[PDB]
Amino acid sequence: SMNPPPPETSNPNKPKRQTNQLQYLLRVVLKTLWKHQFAWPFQQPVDAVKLNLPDYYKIIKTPMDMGTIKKRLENNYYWNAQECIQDFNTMFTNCYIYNKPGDDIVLMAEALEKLFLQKINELPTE
């Protein structure tokens, strides 16, 4: 079995910015989810080899995880907050696509997503 290359976290020819919204996404949103008791399955790319999930990357073609998001934020990879919000939403959606309703992993994603929504509700104006 093989894992794919992880999502990129640096791309020198991609234009980058540091906005107050992106700062909030790191200092408030990511930090809140990262410290949560249910964060651990989401802190690095899914290791389909070790988890014995050979179909994971057959079903999930746009993988995303908080380790990737954290590095993107720390490296100022994004142009705007919407790009980063999309990454969080991709991460949650992938979990719901792959897994079964009520699975532990889905309950974990739901708990993190609730906090995400609470924090994004107060995203500052630019």
Ligand X SMILES: CC(=O)c1c(C)[nH]c(-c2csc(N3CCNCC3)n2)c1CCC(C)C
Interface positions with ligand X (CB under 6 A): 40-42, 44, 46-47, 51, 56, 95, 98-99, 105
Nearer to ligand X, 33 or 46 (CB): 46
113: its two tokens? 């997503």
Nearer to ligand X, 21 or 113 (CB): 113
First to last CA, the chain: 45
Q: What burial class does residue 71 get, using C-beta atoms within 10 Å of its C-beta: 0-12 exposed, 13-18 middle, 19+ buried?
A: middle
Shortest gap between Cβ of 65 and ligand X (angstroms)?
A: 7
Shortest gap between Cβ of 98 and ligand X (angstroms)?
A: 5
Q: Which residue minimizes CB distance to ligand X? A: 41
Nearer to ligand X, 22 or 113 (CB): 113
Dihedral Cα 22, 116, 95, 87, nearest 10 deg? -10
CA distances from 66 to 44, 83, 93, 104, 126 (A): 6, 14, 13, 18, 24
Nearer to ligand X, 26 or 112 (CB): 112
Shortest gap between Cβ of 3 and ligand X (angstroms)?
A: 10
Shortest gap between Cβ of 32 and ligand X (angstroms)?
A: 18
Cα atoms found within 13 Å of the Cα of residue 119, Cβ hemisphere only: 21
